[PDB]
Amino acid sequence: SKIIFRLLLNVLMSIIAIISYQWYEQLGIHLTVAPFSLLGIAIAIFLGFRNSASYSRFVEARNLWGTVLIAERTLVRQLRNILPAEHDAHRRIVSYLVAFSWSLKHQLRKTDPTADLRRLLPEERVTEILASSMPTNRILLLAGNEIGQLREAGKLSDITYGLMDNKLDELAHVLGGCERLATTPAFAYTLILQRTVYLFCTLLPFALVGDLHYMTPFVSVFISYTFLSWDSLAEELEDPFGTAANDLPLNAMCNTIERNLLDMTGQHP
Amino acid sequence: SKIIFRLLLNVLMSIIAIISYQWYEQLGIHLTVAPFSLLGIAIAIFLGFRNSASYSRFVEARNLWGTVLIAERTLVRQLRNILPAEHDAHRRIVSYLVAFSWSLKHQLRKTDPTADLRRLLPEERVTEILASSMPTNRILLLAGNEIGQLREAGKLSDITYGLMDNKLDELAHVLGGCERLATTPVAFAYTLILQRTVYLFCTLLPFALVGDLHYMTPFVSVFISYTFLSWDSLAEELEDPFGTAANDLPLNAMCNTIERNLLDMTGQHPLPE
Amino acid sequence: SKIIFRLLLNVLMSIIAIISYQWYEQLGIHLTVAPFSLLGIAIAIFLGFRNSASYSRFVEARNLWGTVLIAERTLVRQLRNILPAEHDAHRRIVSYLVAFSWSLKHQLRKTDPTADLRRLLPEERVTEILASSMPTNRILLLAGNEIGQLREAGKLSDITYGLMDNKLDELAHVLGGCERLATTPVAFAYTLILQRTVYLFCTLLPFALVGDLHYMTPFVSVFISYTFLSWDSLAEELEDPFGTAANDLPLNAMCNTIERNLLDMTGQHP
Amino acid sequence: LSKIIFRLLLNVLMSIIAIISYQWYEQLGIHLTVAPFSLLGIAIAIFLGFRNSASYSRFVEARNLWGTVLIAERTLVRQLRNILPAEHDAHRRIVSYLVAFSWSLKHQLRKTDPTADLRRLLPEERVTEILASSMPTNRILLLAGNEIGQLREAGKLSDITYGLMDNKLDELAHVLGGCERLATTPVAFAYTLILQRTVYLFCTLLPFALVGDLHYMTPFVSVFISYTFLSWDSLAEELEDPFGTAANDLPLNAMCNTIERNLLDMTGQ
Amino acid sequence: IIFRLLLNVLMSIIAIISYQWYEQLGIHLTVAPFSLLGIAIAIFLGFRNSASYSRFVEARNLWGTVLIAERTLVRQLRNILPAEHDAHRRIVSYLVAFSWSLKHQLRKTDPTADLRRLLPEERVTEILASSMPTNRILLLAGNEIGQLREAGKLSDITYGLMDNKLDELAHVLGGCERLATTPVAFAYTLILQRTVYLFCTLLPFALVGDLHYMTPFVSVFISYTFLSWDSLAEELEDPFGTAANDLPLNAMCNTIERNLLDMTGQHPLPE
Ligand SMILES: [Cl-]
Ligand SMILES: [Cl-]
Ligand SMILES: [Cl-]
Ligand SMILES: [Cl-]
Ligand SMILES: [Cl-]
Ligand SMILES: [Cl-]
Ligand SMILES: [Cl-]
Ligand SMILES: [Cl-]
Ligand SMILES: [Cl-]
Ligand SMILES: [Cl-]
Ligand SMILES: [Cl-]
Ligand SMILES: [Cl-]
Ligand code: NA
Ligand SMILES: [Zn+2]
Ligand SMILES: [Zn+2]
Ligand SMILES: [Zn+2]
Ligand SMILES: [Zn+2]
Ligand SMILES: [Zn+2]
Ligand SMILES: [Zn+2]
Ligand SMILES: [Zn+2]
Ligand SMILES: [Zn+2]
Ligand SMILES: [Zn+2]
Ligand SMILES: [Zn+2]
Ligand SMILES: [Zn+2]
Ligand SMILES: [Zn+2]
Ligand SMILES: [Zn+2]
Ligand SMILES: [Zn+2]
Ligand SMILES: [Zn+2]
Ligand SMILES: [Zn+2]
Ligand SMILES: [Zn+2]
Ligand SMILES: [Zn+2]
């Protein structure tokens, strides 16, 4: 958030514009507003569409995480409703579902899931999970064996197994959607558009000065602020899985998921 | 609204601009229209996309609430169609479905669900529900218990149980979606910045217009201002869909419809079932 | 088409503006184009987005009606494919399905479904349906009973019952979707504000076009007003999809299509 | 079809008129500045933008529905092969229905005679049943459904596997309804014509408004702008008839051939 | 792009040194008409880019579904039939073959080496003999699932759960094939590109009256803004074109192979 830096440099560029207006018609240099109107409206259009895309990715990310909570709540719901007495199963599945959420956070944050895993699962499971090119996937497989074994033992039918299998499928879709949003970056343009906006804002006073004279800085900074604010919104929407204040609060969301699942299985945080 | 204040303040700034125009050249200050055009067009473009995001949130809230009515109607339809004789289960499940709606409403309004729940559920359940940090979720789990019991007693097969389970799933998506929409909107921070940008734009505008319009300044300036502020205020009215304002969702009426709907669909006759 | 009114109304102001221009200097009033460019462009942007929303609402209402035809077509196909000999059950269910659509139309037009119900259903059922304050919903429930009976009788299994149950769900989504779109549209209030803004703008516009256009004022002004008024009125047309106007959804025709479909050839099938 | 080249020629002519008739503009009091035409052009571009968006989406939807036919038919055949590998008679019958469905859909949307295609694929008895119907394509689905219906009655399909295939007939029904929906007069088609006339009027007036500024340049600039608006506007009419036979409508014949070839490929024919 | 920028500079010089001549003869270019046109062009490019982006997102989503569906199908095989490792390995081969085969089909490259490395020779012959190889692979995968069903190792229910996944892959195949053909408004895109090109080359002549020697600077900047946006659109429209960036597609086919070898304990290397 060196937007305040970019403003100050604008005020500076404005002063340089006023000062150097003295030599403007002489060097053979004239700068009108109308060409900058054209360019500025074009950039605003492009910024409008770009931000629209950024916003949508951020919302999709928030939604995918939304689905983790919904699908996990419902899997636990089904286990209790279908197998009310299998409390061991209840607890092991819950510990996989909770491990899934934390490991999803670690995967997207590019951090180590070991501590969280060790808190939740026996060490043999941790080892098996850590060895996988995709830990969240191994957890889904392991949650799968729990309902799998219940099915082998005749406690679930093929139908009731399928109802719960569908929830693991839904979690696979969340996993896939997040990995798609993480490793998605023509982000190359987000930077190009940014430099465009920067260059435009810094050239702008030079074009305004002929008309506004001493008023240049105020108008220049006002227009710069509007474009720079809008442009920086994109930047803040473009790393939804990051650690910045305006990124998704994944730690808090994992705590909510865990709290919900412990609540449903009669445990106290 | 506060908009009439904003218009009147704009008239004032216009009159100041007319009367302070004289001192303009003396202070060496020019304000042309062209840079304000650029700025205004930029702001309008941004307001367009912003409002589009606001509208979408409101429409989603509305769809989520539409889903409750649909999912609950069909769950009751399925119970009557599949277990026509099981009136006690019908009444238990209906009262959970109605409790879910009211509970959802209270949670989003951050109001006390107690009256509505006491009105609908037996006391052993009501205290269990208010014991949770997640009452609405608890109510779904209890509705699930009902159909779970019909399964265990052989009244529902695994298949017919499945058909009803799927409807509990739809209600779960509603709960999750509503909860997501209830937390601070995405990039709210900017919506506030934009509003301030619009405010500053409207109030600086006459100073830009005056050199061209003179006394006509107030008329044109408040007109432009009304256009920008009306559009910007629409976004505020759309952003709290679960709020208590009249422009927000009539959640109370919606929960009444749901209740009346499910009561309509059931009732009458005793017998061992 | 009070666009023809507003256009003439606009041609008046255009004359006024030609007869005043000189007298502007005497009253101390200048009105340049540029401020009106800014304001007109903003309005166009907001009109664009607003129309988009209106259009989306219209299209959704159209798709929901499409679903009625699709889901009713496939429910009857399932009955024919799974229980080919059960012609009595076919007739009964088909009449509920046909009653569903007409009942949905009446609900959305706020008209009396009594005649249509009596044409299709037993009187006992017509009274049952009219008793409900949600009659379309009651029809689905009644359609479901037919399917339910066939399952209790063991003619459908749980699986094949489930296949048909899904189609009743689909019709439930349509009922719900339509009820949602029938209620006063999102921020309807603003479409009325935008409408007034467009009007005022078109009215004030010639007063600011004179200085540039002189005599050409009424022509260019009426052209601009048509463009903005055309587009705004389109919103009006799209906003009430279940209305009775000629530009609203042809609900009677669509209900006729559904009926002819389900009764294709005295309801006979290979 | 391509009447734009006309409108361009009419535009060059109005440019020549404008130049010639410019002098007499005074002593009448008729001026045309660019600025009000800037306002009008921009408003038109915005509306063209939104309108073309809807036209584009409708054409995309027509293409997607046809794509669903390929997908749903592939998988129905796949399912039949995988579930009943030995039942080649049923394979051939169901395939001929699925192929018949495709061609009949095309005939329906083109309002052409399906008879020869139907006869090349099905026995006369079935062709008779199909053509007797007021809704032939829908009746083909019913017949396809009776084929899988019979396999179910004979116990070769269980209810579960009958269900898997029934779902594909549902998809085909969504395609049929969707196409019938798209085949009817577009939402607000009337405005499309209104917008067209607006663009035409604007384009023919434009050179009168530029001549003041551009003199002899008028014809070249007015035609460049006119082309731009007319190119964009004519994209609507290019996208508004997806089922037609023009070069830029969907190649339904080739698509039906692709469908047929795929199904024949999958059944060793 | 850069060649169109330098030509823009060259047109600007031509504009400066010739400005005097032509304006004398009664041929004027002002800024306002080019402002109208440029803004209209920008509006059109906005909408165009919007369609380009949406095609791109669909491609990403379709390939996302390959990973999801293939992962869950293999998970189902292990959860439902834990002991059936031969069947596991065969099906994994078909799934991995499907992905590589899809990529080859979309890129129009030769799938033979990927097929020959994954599958028995007889099966490769069958697949290469078909005009729809990727579809043939789906059919073969379905065969494996269908065989376990005939042997009564899958019930109809559990067979069904897996059949659903094969369906997801059928929708990926077709969506990608549809995306692979020429875009719906491709002809206009050619028109708009040329329209941007001509606008950029004429622009200096419209500016020079106002900017003089500054003309090459403002002209090159405006041009860059328009051509960047156009260029981005070109890339996005064509997620499987023969000019595409192959990194993500290759990445994805490798990720899924790795994932499935992991899931069937073919990794890591034994002790
Ligand atoms: Cl769920
Ligand atoms: Cl528990
Ligand atoms: Cl439902
Ligand atoms: Cl009851
Ligand atoms: Cl009842
Ligand atoms: Cl259907
Ligand atoms: Cl499919
Ligand atoms: Cl065959
Ligand atoms: Cl001249
Ligand atoms: Cl075969
Ligand atoms: Cl294995
Ligand atoms: Cl394994
Ligand atoms: Na970050
Ligand atoms: Zn779900
Ligand atoms: Zn438990
Ligand atoms: Zn899936
Ligand atoms: Zn539903
Ligand atoms: Zn009852
Ligand atoms: Zn009792
Ligand atoms: Zn209380
Ligand atoms: Zn004066
Ligand atoms: Zn359907
Ligand atoms: Zn019959
Ligand atoms: Zn004049
Ligand atoms: Zn005059
Ligand atoms: Zn004159
Ligand atoms: Zn499908
Ligand atoms: Zn065969
Ligand atoms: Zn055509
Ligand atoms: Zn294995
Ligand atoms: Zn590995």
Author numbering:
A (entry chain C): 22 to 206, 208 to 291
B (entry chain D): 22 to 294
C (entry chain B): 22 to 291
D (entry chain A): 21 to 289
E (entry chain E): 24 to 294
Sentences from the paper on this structure:
Human bestrophin1 (hBest1) is a Ca2+-activated Cl− channel essential for Cl− transport in retinal pigment epithelium (RPE). Although the structure of hBest1 is still unsolved, two Best1 homolog structures, one from bacteria Klebsiella pneumoniae (KpBest) and the other from chicken (cBest1), have been previously reported. Overall, the channel is a pentameric assembly with a single ion-conducting pathway, which varies in diameter along its length and is constrained at two narrow points: a “neck” contributed by three residues (I62/I66/F70 in KpBest and I76/F80/F84 in hBest1/cBest1) on a transmembrane helix, and an “aperture” formed by a single residue (I180 in KpBest1, I205 in hBest1, and V205 in cBest1) on a cytosolic helix. Here, by electrophysiological and structural analyses, we show that the neck and aperture in hBest1 are both indispensable Ca2+-dependent gates, and their dysregulated opening by rationally designed or patient-derived mutations causes Ca2+-independent leak and elevates Ca2+-dependent channel activity.
hBest1 P233A is a patient-derived mutation localized on the C-terminus of a loop connecting to helix S3b. Tiny Cl− current indistinguishable from that of the untransfected control was recorded in HEK293 cells expressing the hBest1 P233A mutant, despite normal expression and membrane trafficking, indicating severely impaired channel function. The corresponding KpBest P208A showed alterations in the local structure (2.5 Å resolution), as the hydrogen bond network around P208 is changed by the alanine substitution. Consequently, the conformations of Y211 and W252 (equivalent to Y236 and W287 in hBest1/cBest1) located near F70 (equivalent to F84 in hBest1/cBest1), which is one of the three neck-forming residues, are both changed. Notably, the location and position of these critical residues within the channel structure are well preserved among species, and patient mutations have been reported on all involved residues in hBest1 (F84, P233, Y236, and W287). Therefore, the P233A mutation may impair opening of the neck through Y236 and W287. Taken together, we concluded that hBest1 P233, Y236, and W287 are critical residues involved in channel gating at the neck.
